């Protein structure tokens, strides 16, 4: 930040207060921005500060007054994402309400549920034809035509703002569709756009990289031949998907422009897709490269300057050692992506439900490194994906188990194969290398409700209801944003109508991606003692309690309290108003949990926030019914 | 929320102001209204609107420059916690004569690295005896000899330009009997009579005095009694009257608009009376602080509060906020304990007591900040509790008697030259006056001429300053400790000072002497001056000193040494202090286990190889070790 930049800035604004705000923000986040661009682009052209600033100034001018207010509000409350009132809902626009206009019609449903974070599945304009479910983007400044237009998106954002809901979008950083304007300008041979991709004249560069790359479709391959470069283009994922070259600063500028464009249309949180892949280095797997963080840090800083209201969420499923970098280590500590996904917690929930054992869970959480306190996990029980058993062999070992043996068990269990399993999932992928399988299926089908409905047995139906509620309780209390997956609140079962639909039939993930039935949702509200109704009212109650428990603030991490019974998981959360201990029984059986381990942190008298009832810990044991969850804090003893 | 919205929206010609005000009121509204209810009941319901009238007026009058600093503070909430922050404490008159005079010396301060200037009481006191400025006659005026408010305002404009914050003392608990309010009450306006604790006969006063450990005074037109904790010309305000609350929100915002950035809230412990109690540290104190703090958050985000309470540690922590008050009762309190343990360990050559006292200290909210000092305008009282002493293998009172004996000069072969200020005819507990340089042994050493004893004194001063510069929090340099000023024995020649021997450590700044010291690097004062400016430079570049992170005691295998650990994302730091003249051989494993195999002393620049069994630490040496 020189005299030059400041004067440029100062002369770019009619109102003096705008100039001052911009300048104060540039002073505050300048360090983050320039240090990072230097580490990536080195001594560059040096013209870059000035070109970046034109992009930032343009975006700031176009930023509407209501979004500037949200901007100041965010500065007053930096931890908005970490507040216990925060509840997320994840849906496909079309499968929830047909169109973006349609989503406006259903805000009463969402606001009623307590949702303050709405993540719609990919909707930026994809190429026509196969599109890797929206990850092949044709234009980032347009919407898929069937869903509406950008205007529609912009309006839906105004409406959501009015009910205090943030809109969340997927932004693919790593590649565009072969039909993207840039990809076309490059094929018509404009040198500028040729430099947006990894382009190769002969078969040598491709060969040099493929030496150390693993493959993502086990189409097979990392490079593709195209007529008008002939020549080779870097194509991680599918052939119609061309990796952008982030070593070219022109690409950086395109993305700061797109992020700020979309932010000005009311996007509040960006899910940054394929972020792990954006930096290539010969000799490596070309994932999780240092430069990835420097770029994220620079993108985040431009967003901090123009649009304080905005936050980033990193989509990378990677081992925990690797994942922690996406929240920031060493220099960065929240200066990169703010949110992420806690894939491990989701895996351990299903694993423990199947194993009736929580040693593995304890171990996985203990080996997880602490996050920066200003960042936040996103927690889910299910999402639009298959489930892969990401259980490391070291974690399994510390639990007295063999990684492969345990993971084979889980696929056997959740597929329905294992004797006396409650689950009804489908196998999605079978890998002949390992034997490792991936499971499709809805929360309700996997937790046993499908199986139980076939028998009619009240006892097994109750077990299924309580399992769904237990899973949702853990994510609601763990610390972080619970991402309810659309229709889990109605306990939707596997849908097999996708087979009759010729475009879905090949891909059985559609099994857990149903159409929302609005009539069914009305039925469930009015039948409180059906299974769905039990889940629906049970969940609405947990969301209400969460929103009023300060100890769930996400800046505080849950610590594992090692359990005297392997059927139980215990989590401690320290807070100024007084500690909380969360107690989960992952078994059908009644557990008599020894008192000492809770007495030690909470004292003699406690009260369960969930049901209201009191417990004495000066008793040898505490009775835990099957699938029972307690949120214990300190209390009294007048009786 | 509805009534405020409309009022607010119309109260502003500019829309952006209205929006900002509203957003801030939503953000800090809970804090404010919840707290006033807990103090005044849901009884007094005109009050939100009266408070808002005060806040809106103040906001309108808030100059553009101070609103910008306001946004800058929101961008960096932790401004007080950055390693860049260094405080300097001085009397206006004794540093540079007048407020105009202080402007002429900013190059001195900015050059030292100072970003926080605390001037001793300067709001207009009563004439005559004034408890050194704690008897305030008008909060909207300055003591006439120092200048005017317009001078204060200009000095703030100059300080802002060098990135220095001005810090003032605001007495919350009482006004001078000559304050306008106290005279309106004597002329019998019922409104102002209600600003004080007033009693018709001696019943009432007697009921209180049962548990207060004079507290009341007779006046002709009040014939009756008024509550007067300190002296008699100092009348306790009645904070149970909301009119008083509003007076102070008005005063705080007024002074904030004149460029005050940090308020030292004086006698805050006393502001709530409750029959049956010592009338100190009452819960209402916190609720009131929280509400004052929220009004300041709304109108003047740039402002912060610092609580002046010397109280046992268990009590002190409430001034930073517990339970629902976490990080709302202050952004700053004094770490009186650390100062006491510095001198104690320097005298004892032993740091067990230090370890114990720090272990018993409870964790602060991470968004708040200690103020740390080696000395200040006060005498020293040995605030060492009997429990702490016990855990160290010491007798509380035995150790306390030693320290007074040592720092007074009485103990045989002590290096200290202090004066006894107060003597208890019961415990025998004494208070000590004296400057850092006199107490650390430099006065004694200059009488001998011995190079070896002079070097020892220089290294003691540097050791003390290093601890406060590395502990986490704002180091409050006391004026002229950087020049190693000795006890001034011309205070007895001053007839106004002679009764009060604290003047011994409250010297006039000699600007010629300051110039001499800059230019004589290997005189004693020059060694201190050079050494200090180097420590300030290193501090300003060590991220691990961010005040949100607390120093933890690493139990030491040698009682001559104190070891402190600080965890941080760029990598941990261990601080090692030797409180003795003798060389200490620390075992290597104790550092290798926290820092790894290769380390660097940030203070001297040299690397350390922990691959040896031991690490040499010369007398009075400090290391700030980090990995690398």
TrEMBL record, chain A:
A Gene Ontology molecular function term of the record: amylosucrase activity
GO biological process terms held by the UniProt record: carbohydrate metabolic process
InterPro entries: Amylosucrase (IPR044077), Amylosucrase_C (IPR055218), GH (IPR017853), GH13_cat_dom (IPR006047), Glyco_hydro_b (IPR013780), O16G_dom_2 (IPR045857)
SMART domains: Aamy
Signal peptide start-end: none
SUPFAM superfamilies referenced in this protein's UniProt entry, alphabetically: (Trans)glycosidases
Ranges where the Glycosyl hydrolase family 13 catalytic domain occurs: 90-525
UniProt name for this protein: Amylosucrase
């Amino acid at each position: 930040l020189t005299s030059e930049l400041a004067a440029q800035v100062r002369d770019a604004f009619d109102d003096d207060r705008d100039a001052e705000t911009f300048l104060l923000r540039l002073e505050r986040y300048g360090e983050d921005l320039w240090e990072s661009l230097r580490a990536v682009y080195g001594d560059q052209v040096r013209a870059l500060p000035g070109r970046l600033l034109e992009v930032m100034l343009h975006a700031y001018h176009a930023r509407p007054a209501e979004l500037r207010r949200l901007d100041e509000a965010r500065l007053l409350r930096p931890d908005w994402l970490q507040r216990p009132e925060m509840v997320g809902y994840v849906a496909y626009t079309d499968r929830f309400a047909g169109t973006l206009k349609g989503v406006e019609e259903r805000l009463d449903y969402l606001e009623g549920l307590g949702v303050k974070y709405l993540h719609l599945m990919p909707l930026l304009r994809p190429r026509e034809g196969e599109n890797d479910g929206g990850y092949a983007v044709q234009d980032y400044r347009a919407v898929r035509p069937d869903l509406g237009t950008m205007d529609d998106l912009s309006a839906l954002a105004r409406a959501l703002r009015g009910r205090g809901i943030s809109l969340v979008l997927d932004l693919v950083l790593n590649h565009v569709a072969r039909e993207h304007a840039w990809a076309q300008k490059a094929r018509a041979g404009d040198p500028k756009y040729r430099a947006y991709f990894h382009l190769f004249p002969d078969r040598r560069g491709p060969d040099a990289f493929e030496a150390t790359l693993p493959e993502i479709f086990p189409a097979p391959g990392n490079f593709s031949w195209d007529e008008e470069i002939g020549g080779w283009v870097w194509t991680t994922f599918n052939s119609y998907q061309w990796d952008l070259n982030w070593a070219n600063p022109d690409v950086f500028l395109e993305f700061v422009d797109i992020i700020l464009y979309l932010a000005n249309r009311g996007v509040e949180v960006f899910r940054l897709d394929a972020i792990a892949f954006i930096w290539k280095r010969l000799g490596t797997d070309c994932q999780n490269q240092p430069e990835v963080h420097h770029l994220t840090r620079a993108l985040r800083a431009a967003a901090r300057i123009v649009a304080p209201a905005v936050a980033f969420k990193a989509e990378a499923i990677v081992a925990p050692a690797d994942l922690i970098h996406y929240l920031g280590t060493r220099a960065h500590h929240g200066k990169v992506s703010d949110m992420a996904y806690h894939n491990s917690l989701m895996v351990q929930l299903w694993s423990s439900l199947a194993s009736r054992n929580t040693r593995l869970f304890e171990e996985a959480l203990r080996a997880f490194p602490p996050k920066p306190t200003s960042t936040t996990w996103g927690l889910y029980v299910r999402c639009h994906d298959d489930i892969g058993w990401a259980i490391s062999d070291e974690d399994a070992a510390r639990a007295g188990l063999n990684g492969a043996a345990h993971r084979h068990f889980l696929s056997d269990f959740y597929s329905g194969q294992f004797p006396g399993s409650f689950a009804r999932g489908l196998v999605f992928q079978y890998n002949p290398v390992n034997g490792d399988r991936r499971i499709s299926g809805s929360a309700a089908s996997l937790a046993g409700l499908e199986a139980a409905l076939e028998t009619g047995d009240p006892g097994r139906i109750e077990d299924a209801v309580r399992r769904l509620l237990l899973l949702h309780t853990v994510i609601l209390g763990f610390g972080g944003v619970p991402l309810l997956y659309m229709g889990d609140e109605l306990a939707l079962l596997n849908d097999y109508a996708f087979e009759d639909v010729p475009e879905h039939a090949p891909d059985n993930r559609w099994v857990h991606r149903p159409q929302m039935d609005w009539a069914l949702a009305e039925r469930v509200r009015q039948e409180p003692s059906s299974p769905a109704g039990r889940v629906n009212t049970g969940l609405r109650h947990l969301l209400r309690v969460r929103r009023d428990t300060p100890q769930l603030h996400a800046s505080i991490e849950s610590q594992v309290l090692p359990s005297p019974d392997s059927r139980a998981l215990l989590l401690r959360r320290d807070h100024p108003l007084g500690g909380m201990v969360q107690v989960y029984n992952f078994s059908e059986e009644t557990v008599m949990l020894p008192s000492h381990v809770l007495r030690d942190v909470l004292g003699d008298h406690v009260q369960d926030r969930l049901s209201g009832s009191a417990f004495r810990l000066d008793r040898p044991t505490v009775r835990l019914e099957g699938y029972r969850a307690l949120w214990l804090t300190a209390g009294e003893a007048p009786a």
